[PDB]
């Protein structure tokens, strides 16, 4: 470094005129340590101007080219410019291959580490991202033709925002890494898969690939991490995930592992739930639970009767089970959640008497509310519930007669 540095800054002050500046800009450089020291200004200003001078700046850069921070700056400013320049570096770079300059193409990888480190930026211009991701895809393919930090970077960039192009390229690269066998980390990969599938003729093919990757990953903790994710992440995303997965085996295990915690967490939100703005969301959940009951979830019975399956008596567990039962019963099809058989058989089940009595009195209160007039806040279903109630009563009476008599 020498007192001349101010002159260099002056050049930036011209770019940060369009025609006049290029004359002296080319002259002073045309007329190795000084070249290296001056390269950052030239890279910055040419990137700024590009975002007849084009040819002059390109020639200046080529003359300059013919340490990690330098490549870092190079990538940050020139990655989005690839598609617009339309040669040793540009032509290979159009196909997402390493540039041919020997300055940093050499192997100790400088370009790779540069792109990886700078890609962590939260608001990189999207144009560059699409390139960088494709580059990684290509490199991974080359690896398969003849890395956890890459997964970490992809995960850190995915959360900020997702798009059709971004999600497609992310799915492709994640599939390529799974094919490579990077996973022996598991939590990150599963979370990335969740994020990718959360936003999905064109879409189905990738979706089929999505569940294929999910099945491949299933072979190797899954339940624990999923149970953590469902509670940690906001409901809207969880319900969107379930809608995408099902649409209204992997589905069996995921539901059997997640439904209990989903109901548990959603139960303690009634005040937010009733607010009209979010009412639409509730509708989705209804379908979800209905589907779980329709033909899929036998776990529904076990989750519904949790209060007496997880059993001095444990007050907290039974209270949580009853909270879940309250949410489920008041959710859909009044008088349909507990069938006649379960109520009739509840007398003899080898479970704490308190739980059975609580279930009976809760059904009693539900029937009382139905009588008073206030069904769930929304008919033929009114008449149907009468038949279900009569079946309940007949079964209970038959059981009582058989037992006592």
Q: How far apart are CA 88 and CA 97, in angstroms?
A: 11
Q: How far apart are CA 105 and CA 117, in angstroms?
A: 16
Between the two ends of the chain, the Cα-to-Cα distance in Å is 105
Q: How far apart are CA 300 and CA 336, in angstroms?
A: 13
Q: How far apart are CA 180 and CA 140, in angstroms?
A: 8
- Determination technique used: cryo-EM
Kindly tell me the burial class for residue 115, based on how many C-beta atoms sit within 10 Å of its own C-beta (0-12, 13-18, 19 or more).
buried
In the three-class reduction of DSSP (H, G, I as helix; E, B as strand; rest coil), residue 84 is classed as helix
Phi and psi, residue 5, nearest 5°: -55, -35
Q: How far apart are CA 268 and CA 231, in angstroms?
A: 12
What b/e readout covers 345-376, taking b as 16+ CB neighbours within 10 angstroms?
ebeeeebeeebbebbeebbeebbeebeeeebe
**C-alpha pair distances (Å), 376 with each of 95, 267, 289:** 59, 15, 15
Q: How far apart are CA 378 and CA 386, in angstroms?
A: 18
Q: Are 158 and 133 in contact (CB under 8 A)?
A: no
CA-based nearest residue to 278, from 330, 235, 241: 235
Longest dimension (CA), the chain: 114
Q: Are 362 and 326 in contact (CB under 8 A)?
A: yes
What the block records as the tokens of 155 is 């995960």
């Amino acid at each position: 470094p020498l007192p001349i540095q101010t002159f260099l800054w002056r050049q930036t002050s011209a770019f940060l005129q369009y025609e006049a500046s290029c004359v002296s800009f080319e002259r002073v450089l045309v007329e190795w340590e000084l070249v290296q020291a001056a390269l950052p200004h030239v890279l910055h200003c040419t990137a700024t101007l590009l975002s007849v001078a084009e040819t002059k700046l390109l020639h200046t850069l080529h003359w300059m080219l013919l340490s990690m921070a330098t490549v870092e700056l190079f990538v940050f400013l020139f990655a989005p410019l690839v598609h617009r320049i339309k040669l040793v570096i540009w032509q290979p770079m159009w196909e997402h291959r390493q540039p041919g300059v020997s300055g940093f193409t050499a192997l100790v990888t400088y370009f790779d580490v540069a792109v990886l480190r700078c890609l962590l930026q939260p608001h990189w211009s999207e144009e560059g991202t699409q390139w960088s991701l494709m580059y990684y895809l290509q490199r991974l393919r080359h690896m398969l033709e003849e890395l956890s930090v890459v997964l970490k970077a992809v995960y850190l960039v995915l959360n900020h925002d997702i798009s059709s192009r971004i999600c497609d390229v992310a799915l492709n690269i994640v599939e390529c890494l799974l094919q490579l066998g990077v996973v022996p980390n598991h939590r990150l990969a599963l979370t990335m898969l969740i994020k990718i599938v959360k936003s999905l003729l064109r879409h189905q093919v990738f979706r089929e690939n999505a569940q294929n990757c999910l099945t491949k990953l299933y072979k190797l903790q899954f339940r624990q991490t999923m149970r953590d994710y469902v509670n940690k992440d906001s409901l809207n995303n969880v319900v969107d995930f379930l809608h995408a997965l099902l649409g209204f085996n992997v589905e069996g295990i995921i539901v059997s592992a997640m439904f209990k915690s989903l109901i548990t967490r959603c139960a303690s939100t009634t005040h937010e739930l009733h607010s009209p703005e979010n009412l639409g969301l509730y509708c989705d959940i209804r379908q979800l639970v209905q589907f779980i009951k329709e033909a899929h979830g036998n776990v529904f019975r076990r989750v519904a009767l949790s209060a007496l399956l997880d059993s001095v008596v444990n007050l907290g567990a039974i209270r949580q089970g009853m909270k879940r039962f309250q949410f489920l019963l008041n959710c859909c099809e009044p008088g349909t959640i507990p069938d006649a058989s379960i109520l009739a058989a509840a007398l003899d089940l080898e479970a704490p008497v308190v739980a059975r009595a609580a279930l009976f009195l809760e059904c009693a209160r539900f029937v009382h509310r139905c009588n008073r007039g206030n069904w769930p806040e929304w008919q033929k279903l009114q008449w149907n519930a009468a038949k279900l109630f009569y079946q309940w009563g007949d079964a209970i009476g038959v059981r009582l007669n058989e037992l006592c008599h």
